[PDB]
Amino acid sequence: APLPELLSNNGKHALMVDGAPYIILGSQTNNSSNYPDALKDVWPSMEKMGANTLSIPVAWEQIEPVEGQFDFSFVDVLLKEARQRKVRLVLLWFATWKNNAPHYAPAWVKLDNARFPRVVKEDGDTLNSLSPLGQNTLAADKKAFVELMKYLAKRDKDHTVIMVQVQNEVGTYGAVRDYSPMAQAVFNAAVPDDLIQKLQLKPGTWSQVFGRDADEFFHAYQIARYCDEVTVAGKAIKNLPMYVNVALRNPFNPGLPGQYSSGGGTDNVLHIWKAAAPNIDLIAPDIYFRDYKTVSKVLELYTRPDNALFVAEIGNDQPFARYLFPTLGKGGIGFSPFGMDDTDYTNYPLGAKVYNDETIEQFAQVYRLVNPMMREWARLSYQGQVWGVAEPLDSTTETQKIWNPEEKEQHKKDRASALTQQLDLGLWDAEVTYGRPMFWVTPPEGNTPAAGGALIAQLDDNEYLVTAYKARVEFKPSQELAGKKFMIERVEEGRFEKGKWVMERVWNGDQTDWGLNFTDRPHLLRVKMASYSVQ
Ligand code: NA
Ligand code: NA
Ligand code: NA
Ligand code: NA
């Protein structure tokens, strides 16, 4: 069985699993489900969701509760139960940092500050965040991580585990960096040549080179070097893909480092992280912004020639489900809503106020569009041209409903324009619209709540794979046609069996007169367009 691998070529990416591109249609447990007794409350949600991959913590405190005394009993049960359900796993190594803090480090780590030191603020107070310059802390984390990877090397030959997250939301809240004597000695000293070279900057100390950014860039660099060393040590045992997940700063209006988690892979320090940690496969955003513009900005910033897009976490409230479409449209390798278990917890206001079957169903509905073509989509995303869009107005607020005669008419025109998206597919364009009948051309009014989206993959110059949700998709020529006319040549609904297209029916007549109209039900279409002479 070939190792999973992240491939990067011509600014595109694939997560290879069993020798072909793979899409993580993911779900992540709540933070306290990493025990055998809790798995009963995880699997039903995962089945209801139709997820193909489970993200779940493996805690340093549980594998090494007494120094040198390893316990992999949780990993044994998890591997067995995952294999029984024919799903894959992403293990989340909760160790030196989990949300900036050492709460998941063993008692013998997190209660020994002298051996395993904390960030010291400028004012001399201590924060509950382990310093990335703690050399004992790095050696201990690395040692335990190596034992976890040795367990997988010996006990996971078919790679049930496809990827490992190293730490969880690293950084520091309440200070920009470590100002300890140990840290100041490194801050005051030369910026390492390797960083100075990769960023093409003039040599000097951190303050000289980075000015107003020296504190933040220094924390980012030391944490990236720490995480890179743990990653290299684990890969030397078994070379799985490994990644870090970011406690995002607001990309538009971030405020100050330490209000957000300073030193994590935030948008302003991706250049430091990529320079400092070449062994970490990707930097994954954890998305809890609900509003379309900010989520779209995060997807743009984290999709780079040097960075595969993996939405390692997203809120589990209804508005987040539609972001699967732009994630995959950007060539994303996966998408993993957070808190998908029945362990009596909700992270509202980040996620759903209520966790029930309806919560899960909002993600199940969009996964049902991708599951039937997962391997074909993954190959097209890597090897070719894909597109994906989500409904670009958020649900109307109570404010807007009350606080909104000729204006009503104007407001409806502005919303209809905003709810109309253009995609350039080469010789053909698609126009995607949201919240309108399946017949005639009444302008779009949006879904209540906002929920729609569309996926398109190019099969050939004039042929597209299309699936969409609570939306209309219409094709037109991309360029003026010089006397020719155009039509849909053929729309087929079907599926892939053993990688071969099987037609179920032809969409025609009402079904293609008014664009291609999708509801909540899955339909996978092959759309062939034609220009023709009327000479
Ligand atoms: Na891709
Ligand atoms: Na074009
Ligand atoms: Na064009
Ligand atoms: Na079908």
User: Half-sphere exposure (CA, 13 Å, Cβ side) for 402?
Assistant: 3
- Residue among 329, 299, 287 nearest 432 (CA): 329
Residues 6+ apart with CB under 8 A from 406: none
Residue 381 · residue 328 · CB < 8 Å:
yes
Residue 248 · residue 286 · CB < 8 Å:
yes
Q: What is the DSSP letter of 278?
A: T
Element (H, E) at 410: helix 406-418
Q: Considering all CA atoms of the chain, what is the largest pairwise distance in Å, rounded to the nearest integer? A: 86
The experimental technique used to determine this model is X-ray
- Please tell me the number of the ligand nearest to residue 426's CA: 2
CA distance linking residue 332 with residue 311, whole number of Å: 8
- Enumerate the β-bridge partners of residue 495: 502
The alpha carbon of 44 and the centre of ligand 1 are apart by a number of angstroms equal to: 29
Please report, for residues 216, 241, 412, 431, 519, the alpha-carbon distance to residue 25 in angstroms, rounded to integers and kept in the order given: 34, 17, 36, 26, 21
Please give the backbone phi and psi of residue 530, each rounded to the nearest 5 degrees, phi first. Answer: -145, 135
What's the CA angle centered on 63, arms 133 and 44, to 5 degrees? 120
CA distance linking residue 37 with residue 35, whole number of Å: 6
- Residue among 352, 338, 332, 197 nearest 276 (CA): 197
Radius of gyration of the chain (CA): 25
User: Half-sphere exposure (CA, 13 Å, Cβ side) for 190?
Assistant: 9
Laid out side by side, the sheet with 485-497 consists of 386-390, 453-460, 463-469, 525-532, 485-497, 500-507
Token pair for residue 346? 């909700």
For the chain, what are the domain ranges? Answer: 1-372, 373-535
Residue 316 · residue 378 · CB < 8 Å:
no
Q: In sequence order, what E strands does 36-182 have?
A: 53-59, 88-98, 118-120, 126-130, 161-168
Angle 214-235/135-155 helices, nearest 10 degrees?
Answer: 30
- Enumerate the β-bridge partners of residue 503: 494
Residue 21 · residue 29 · CB < 8 Å:
no
CA distance linking residue 174 with residue 211, whole number of Å: 20
- Residue among 116, 146, 152, 157 nearest 231 (CA): 146
Please report, for residues 49, 454, 457, 495, 519, the alpha-carbon distance to residue 505 in angstroms, rounded to integers and kept in the order given: 27, 20, 20, 11, 18
The alpha carbon of 481 and the centre of ligand 3 are apart by a number of angstroms equal to: 11
Check the CA dihedral 155-158-161-163 and report its sign: positive
Residues 6+ apart with CB under 8 A from 71: 62, 63, 64, 65
Element (H, E) at 15: strand 12-17
- Enumerate the β-bridge partners of residue 351: none
The alpha carbon of 376 and the centre of ligand 1 are apart by a number of angstroms equal to: 12
- Please tell me the number of the ligand nearest to residue 523's CA: 4
The alpha carbon of 311 and the centre of ligand 4 are apart by a number of angstroms equal to: 27
Q: In sequence order, what E strands does 132-172 have?
A: 161-168
Four-CA torsion 8, 10, 14, 18, nearest 10 degrees: -80
Please report, for residues 29, 53, 75, 78, 268, the alpha-carbon distance to residue 90 in angstroms, rounded to integers and kept in the order given: 11, 7, 12, 11, 27
- Residue among 360, 430, 419 nearest 388 (CA): 430
CA distance linking residue 19 with residue 2, whole number of Å: 6
Q: Chain centroid to CA 527: how far? A: 29
The alpha carbon of 502 and the centre of ligand 4 are apart by a number of angstroms equal to: 10
The alpha carbon of 310 and the centre of ligand 1 are apart by a number of angstroms equal to: 10
The alpha carbon of 12 and the centre of ligand 1 are apart by a number of angstroms equal to: 6
Q: In sequence order, what E strands does 34-136 have?
A: 53-59, 88-98, 118-120, 126-130
Residues 6+ apart with CB under 8 A from 125: none
User: Half-sphere exposure (CA, 13 Å, Cβ side) for 235?
Assistant: 20
The alpha carbon of 391 and the centre of ligand 4 are apart by a number of angstroms equal to: 23
Query: Residue 120, SS3?
Result: strand
- Residue among 490, 492, 487 nearest 531 (CA): 487
- Residue among 415, 341, 447 nearest 46 (CA): 341
Amino acid at 236: A
The alpha carbon of 7 and the centre of ligand 1 are apart by a number of angstroms equal to: 9
Please report, for residues 285, 302, 334, the alpha-carbon distance to residue 13 in angstroms, rounded to integers and kept in the order given: 16, 13, 11
Q: Which residue has the tokens 């599926």?
A: 495
Alpha helices by DSSP H, listed for 163-291, are 181-188, 193-198, 206-210, 214-235, 270-276
Q: Chain centroid to CA 270: how far? A: 16
Please report, for residues 18, 242, 419, the alpha-carbon distance to residue 2 in angstroms, rounded to integers and kept in the order given: 6, 16, 44
User: Half-sphere exposure (CA, 13 Å, Cβ side) for 89?
Assistant: 27
The alpha carbon of 503 and the centre of ligand 1 are apart by a number of angstroms equal to: 26
Token pair for residue 329? 């449209």
